[PDB]
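Input:
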Amino acid sequence: ETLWEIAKAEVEKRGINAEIAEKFVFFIGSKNGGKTTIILRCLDRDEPPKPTLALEYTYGRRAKGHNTPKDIAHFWELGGGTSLLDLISIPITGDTLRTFSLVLVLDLSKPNDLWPTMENLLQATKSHVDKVIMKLGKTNAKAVSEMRQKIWNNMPKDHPDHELIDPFPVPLVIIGSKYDVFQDFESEKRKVICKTLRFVAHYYGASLMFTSKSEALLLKIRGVINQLAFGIDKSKSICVDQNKPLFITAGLDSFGQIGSPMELWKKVYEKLFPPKIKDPARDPQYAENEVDEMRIQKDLELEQYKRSSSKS
Amino acid sequence: EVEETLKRLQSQKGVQGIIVVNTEGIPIKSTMDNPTTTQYASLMHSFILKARSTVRDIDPQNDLTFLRIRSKKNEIMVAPDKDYFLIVIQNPT
Amino acid sequence: IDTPRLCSFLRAACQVMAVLLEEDRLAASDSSS
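Output:
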């Protein structure tokens, strides 16, 4: 009697705070943007990138040195303006929102042609994460209030919190890809690109860093968001001056200095680059028994799948 | 093909309903209401079995070739099967 | 039921019904045209 009641009382008392729910990060990008290589490097692997992308799943483990806690970091990704919410809604659940972070990768090749891709994916994530905080019917939402106040008091750490330029309730880091093309851009094009790259970071309060092979900052900064996988914050100064490397600590990039909105984007868009069938009929085809059976199969299988009454 | 023929048959003023009973009283296709669909499939399943037994009892080397049962309300026809048969109901009037 | 190997029965059943219906259709001193 009292033996199990107390045992129950202890597992009830405990349960607030192997490791506690591990974090995971999702990679917004395009298809064949080089982002697969970036992810695989975050896993500290040398494997050739996979062509396809359909919520690819991979993870790894880290230790601390006093022990091996087996800190697992999960990785999810999607590329291109394909099945936006149908797939974005899959790896993201409200129960783990506080443990969820985004990183957005942009191919420098054609920022304009890539902009609707990342924008659509980003909107899908933004809308989704905003809802799941209470869509689950989380009555005891105190945690929801706490975690939101954390996110919107991490970047305006010291600077007076004048306004939340865009309430964005999930961590975000932004980075380009294949900067090898940037050195070959026209001076005028590099400048207008810099305006938007600088702006978008401070707009979301998302840090920036470069991407290369010898560049350890990529692994380091990614590691921080990935459960300190490659160290700690190690906040450095903004590199808006050199423009050769890339690095921005969110909070030091005040608009008045880095930009010096709608008009900014419109201007950069116009200057940088403005030029931004299934045949179900099967008419040139014929068959008699093959098409008759296919019609039969279609009906019978479709009705069977409905009858399964799956809750999924 | 078969679906088009069934529709054409159903369009005939004589036909009052068609049931495709597959797994021994379990239908998949019907042009009738659910209570009648289930009852009719069951009844004709039992009924045809009785006729087949009757024929074998008359002669131990012959099976059913066709079975028809008539009533004042409607008339029902079934055919022998290996795996499943089909049910047709018509108004003889 | 998914297999045409069984749908053959469905065809045959339709053929019987069609003929029976056709048979059922065979129902009934000066100018009356």
